[PDB]
Scaffold this active site. Structure first.
Site, PDB file in Angstrom:
ATOM      1  CE  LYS A 119      -4.126   1.110   2.725  1.00  0.00           C
ATOM      2  NZ  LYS A 119      -4.861   1.902   1.831  1.00  0.00           N
ATOM      3  CG  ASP A 162      -5.202  -1.153  -0.128  1.00  0.00           C
ATOM      4  OD1 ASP A 162      -6.093  -0.897   0.876  1.00  0.00           O
ATOM      5  OD2 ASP A 162      -4.669  -0.365  -0.809  1.00  0.00           O
ATOM      6  CD  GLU A 163      -6.703  -0.376   4.833  1.00  0.00           C
ATOM      7  OE1 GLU A 163      -5.841  -1.079   4.567  1.00  0.00           O
ATOM      8  OE2 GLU A 163      -6.878   1.077   4.554  1.00  0.00           O
ATOM      9  CG  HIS A 165      -7.357  -3.653   8.525  1.00  0.00           C
ATOM     10  ND1 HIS A 165      -8.336  -2.598   7.850  1.00  0.00           N
ATOM     11  CD2 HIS A 165      -6.098  -3.018   8.806  1.00  0.00           C
ATOM     12  CE1 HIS A 165      -7.742  -1.439   8.080  1.00  0.00           C
ATOM     13  NE2 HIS A 165      -6.581  -1.719   8.317  1.00  0.00           N
ATOM     14  N   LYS A 207       7.555   8.089  26.176  1.00  0.00           N
ATOM     15  CA  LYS A 207       7.947   7.571  27.458  1.00  0.00           C
ATOM     16  C   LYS A 207       7.139   6.761  28.229  1.00  0.00           C
TER      17      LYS A 207
END
Ligand SMILES: [Zn+2]
Ligand SMILES: [Zn+2]
Ligand SMILES: [Zn+2]
Ligand SMILES: [Zn+2]
Ligand SMILES: [Zn+2]
Ligand SMILES: [Zn+2]
Lengths: 447, 73, 447, 73, 158, 140, 73
Positions: free
Chosen positions: A156, A184-185, A275, A315
């Site tokens: 993609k 690719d979705e 996904h 962090k």
């Protein structure tokens, strides 16, 4: 007036389903009424015994608010903790659980906004679900890959290519060092590329890349479809080609379709990458919708072996700690209650296997040490531009990423600090790897 | 529907029913209602002895805003 | 820098899918940059030709913003109109249409918020969908009910009743003169009431009420289920019992499961009532989510014979006009663009049949003349408390509702103004109906 | 990543690619690299003669905040 | 024998031109034609399944019209329901629903659908006791011109 | 008499199916009448509103000739350009398309001969067909 | 059937119907018919007040040559 649906004395039963709603009521409405109304609206629809009295078991099948927690932020915002009895819900159905709890309350006019932050899924309800088809342990055994995260690449944006050309891109990423590639979705079956043709050439790319490298290769073939019939037909063909893994879009397809596919995957030994297209429609806005951790819990229950969690490098404080709260909820068997990580309830998974956390987006070789340290082994690092953008091509880009990963794994085993010595770890490996050296010129180190 | 600074139903005070206006809570007719078809003294023509009828403002919810009291959308 | 994804000279093709987004960009970002990137993010993911140049057909499968339209309250928002070519989408798949357009853009961090207000579904794409299994015309012929809206009643809140006691309530409402009853959306199959027992006793209720009244009756049996196999097994048993109608929760189950059931209903002559549980998670907040009119179009395409549209009694201005745009969008074959009713695009449905609008919520006999005037004949009026709360019981509540409706239909045909003579029309009927006279005491006439 | 009051990527100015910093636009190596592995005067070791490379800050998107240029979630 | 009609020709009526009617309105026409004394009615050859009328709805109301007309007259009635379809699968699916509604007869356009389709449906009709009325749409493309094509007597033999 | 099935003012819709018939009419039959009759005969079978009035949507499902174009030679041929609405045809059925368009007209006795030279298949109708299993690119 | 140098139906002239021969357009019986089974003054026995019937020669087609007006083959 005593509010029966707000019972602050109530101790939750271990079989109850518990919800944590971030309620933003209309101004003037006191929190106890709002809390009791939310409990009723997500349940019977009433406070009273009027309709109740005309039934057999009466107010047994009712939700009730058992705790209120005002927040400092803005005022006119509190967490209502609501308990629901086990008999309310259908066995093994995320569809019914969501219907019951989130079916109506979001439309409740006495609120401005409402958000479902968390759910406590009880051990007794979890055992009615299959859970993931395989999960972390069983997946590593099928793939024979250990002691590191898995590397993947989303093909993609390459929308418009032939099945064959698309497959050549898959061959190079896999051959170059990656374990996985990802559809690719947006590609299911279209005029430019029909699914059966893609599945065929992807299978050629795998067998070939696997033969040349000696390591098992996979590509998440998108079986997302208009109908369950078409979904399973595609899954069956992926099984027929001896593919180890497929992908499904769980929100756009739906939970009913997804629970079917998860059962089919368990029955046929197929790994299942989930996904999460369209998730932002619900989970973006902080005062209205459903937090992803609820959707992630639902997805572990319905079932999937990989799931996207969100990606973090910094962090691990605040918004970054929320992301790791979700990771723990998907991977671990027991998660201690922890408000600083957005974990509103303790969650016992009762040995339902954990899910691989997928970190995705705009990640590149310089993030590798951070990504290994924060996510650990049980994770998939999905690269987009970080692989395909390499100036010598897809294979070299895949090699650059693998060498960066192998560097971090060896640094980790030596007792090095991946966080402060990350740059040094990568630069050291760049001496030996011209592909990695080339990647380090495109993408910039983080401070 | 609601009381000031609240979501509880004002017509029933959150109880979901009200006193029946025809028998006035007694559960007995007071007038020869409808040509003495329901004659005075006997069972209320409306509530039929139940002394209470559903609150019309919330339809028994005891609060306004929800599906049982409010229009859809 | 020229923005290739903002192309204000582009005239949309009749084959394009057009989207209308309410875009709330971050402060400082110009509207054109935001419009270009929303087109790019709902599409290729790039403004550039770097990835594009590596392909065969290049920027052919791209979205583009062809018009921008600022709004009063203007630092906030504009409407970006975007066009996508027909080739992008799999034929007959709402799932893939949603994935392609709304899959990522909502998480686009350069925006504070984003809302899809409308889609223009082009005729050529619509011909790849079945649409409703029957629709308005075909349904009325199957039921033999004309010249009037249909009447329904949700058995709710009666959660926890025996299938037989539930069946008893069903019988009484239907016998009393309603056309339909409805399953509680929360009831699929649970410990207190298993699905096959509910179907059996609801069927007995239908046959009996139909036999005594001489009018065709139905009950929207809820086939919503954890899996597609279980959804169909439940649909099949309703068919085995000769049931005219079932219901499904299209969002909580999902479009893949729904399209399957829509096809099955066409194949077996089964009417399909669509409940919309969980819609408010997405369609409530006015700056973020998907407006219901888009979900209503998606459902019409996927297939449903009934659907809840939103209920309105007032003077058809403002937000009441929004609701009637949806109703036109669901029922008509051709709806002209009209911004005062939220219709952003002209929508040709090309003979795909219309869906019955379901008016529901806290309605009662006094609302009848208004509802008849506003919705007209092709609608289902769902009473909750308005039937079941009647102090002589369920059958008498139904009789009151049916007598009120027939009085409004006779007045409409006479020439009378339902809106201003509605109170008179009910009271005139209540002289001749003891059951209506009782209803007219509980509920209060509207000004 | 972004320019002032804008969402176009500052590093590339929306082009999605920058000049190759090694050959400095030239397409050929100036110095040796990798201990004489790529010689001076030969094709550029990084860009291989193309003179531009992908912009790392946006991964060729031209704009910031999208999936191509941003962390997931 | 199946119809119990002897010593006369049978009468039929094509419901044509009534394209665009509802399945129920089409079925009111079928009912009247049979009730009044015809043996058969016939589907418009152009009608298969279309937006204005889907096949399963037509088949349902036509079946009502036959049962009701057969009852009131005491004579066997029938309607050649058109199972001509885009594919063999869809054709037999329709034939089966005619068999399921106890219908004595169906129709098929043998030239536009073809002889491989038609032979399939002919065998199915033998197996299921269904009468088969063959319509001949497109015949005049081949059999009109006296010097080129195929005469109809050959297509009748076939 | 006005011919409702010959409308030269009509502009074809992009959803219409268009046919180009080479009509050879009987001597004496004017081209306009022949074309309107070819329109009717591949369609409703009528010019009038007698049968149509006894329907709901009426002459919505009619064909019409939108253009006539005489041809060279002394056979008295022209091209009848005819438009049919999308709703007439079953989705994905070539069988029904031919049944509707070429079912009867070829035996129309007011003509000597008739030939279908071309069809404009509209895009909306093409989307209801699979098309080739694979096609050029995929085969290669 | 047809008119000269035309295919329009001569009997109706493309209309598809004709005037009722029995009542001559009146919509009412001028005499009795069938021994007074249909009486004079009442709605016409043939047309029943509509004052027109279908043209038989073309069966409502308005032209001759097609399936509606002509024999098969
Ligand atoms: Zn009240
Ligand atoms: Zn009383
Ligand atoms: Zn850049
Ligand atoms: Zn260079
Ligand atoms: Zn005539
Ligand atoms: Zn007459």
């Amino acid at each position: 007036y005593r509010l029966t649906y707000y019972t602050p004395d109530y101790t939750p039963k271990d079989t109850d389903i518990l919800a944590a709603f971030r309620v933003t009521p209309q101004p003037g409405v006191p929190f106890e009424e709002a809390a009791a109304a939310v409990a009723a609206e997500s349940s019977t629809g009433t406070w009273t015994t009027v309709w109740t009295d005309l039934l057999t078991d009466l107010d047994r099948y009712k939700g009730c608010c058992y705790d209120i927690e005002p927040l400092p932020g803005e005022d006119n915002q509190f967490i209502a903790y609501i308990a629901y009895p086990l008999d309310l819900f259908e066995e093994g159905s995320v569809t019914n659980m969501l219907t019951s709890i989130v079916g109506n309350v979001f439309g409740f006019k006495a609120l401005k906004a409402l958000r479902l932050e968390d759910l406590r899924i009880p051990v007794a309800y979890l055992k009615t679900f299959q859970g993931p088809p395989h999960g972390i342990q069983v997946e590593r055994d099928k793939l024979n890959k250990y002691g590191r995260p898995l590397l993947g690449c989303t093909i993609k944006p390459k929308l418009g290519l032939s099945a064959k050309n698309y497959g050549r891109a898959v061959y190079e990423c896999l051959r170059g060092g990656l374990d996985f590639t990802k559809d690719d979705e947006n590609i299911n079956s279209q005029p430019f590329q029909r699914w059966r043709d893609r599945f065929l050439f992807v299978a050629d790319a795998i067998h070939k890349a696997q033969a040349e490298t000696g390591e098992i290769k996979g590509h998440y073939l998108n079986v997302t479809a208009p109908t369950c019939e078409e979904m399973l037909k595609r899954a069956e063909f992926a099984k027929e080609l001896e593919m180890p893994i497929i992908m499904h879009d769980f929100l756009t397809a739906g939970f009913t379709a997804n629970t079917t596919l998860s059962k089919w995957c368990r029955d046929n030994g197929m790994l299942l990458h989930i996904h999460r297209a369209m998730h932002a429609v619900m989970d973006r806005q902080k005062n209205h919708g459903i937090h992803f951790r609820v959707l992630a819990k639902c997805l572990r229950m319905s079932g999937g072996d990989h799931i996207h969690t969100g990606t973090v490098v910094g962090k691990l404080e605040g918004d970054k700690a929320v992301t790791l709260g979700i990771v723990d909820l998907l991977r671990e068997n027991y998660i201690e209650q922890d408000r600083s990580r957005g974990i509103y309830f303790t969650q016992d998974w009762a040995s339902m296997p954990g899910v691989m956390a997928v970190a995705s987006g705009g990640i590149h070789v310089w993030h590798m040490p951070a990504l290994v340290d924060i996510f650990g082994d049980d994770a998939v690092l999905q690269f987009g531009g970080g692989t395909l953008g390499h100036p010598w091509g897809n294979a070299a880009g895949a090699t650059a990423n693998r060498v960066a990963l192998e560097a971090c794994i060896q640094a980790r085993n030596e007792g090095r600090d991946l966080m402060r010595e990350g740059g040094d770890i990568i630069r050291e490996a760049a001496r030996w790897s011209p592909e990695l050296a080339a990647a380090c010129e495109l993408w910039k180190e983080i401070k | 529907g609601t009381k000031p600074n609240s979501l509880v139903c004002a017509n029933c005070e959150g109880e979901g029913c009200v006193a029946c206006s025809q028998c006035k809570g007694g559960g007995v007719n007071l007038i020869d209602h409808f040509n003495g078809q329901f004659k005075a003294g006997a069972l209320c023509w409306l509530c039929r002895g139940k002394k209470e009828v559903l609150c019309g403002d919330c339809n028994g919810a005891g609060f306004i805003g929800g599906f049982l009291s409010t229009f859809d959308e």
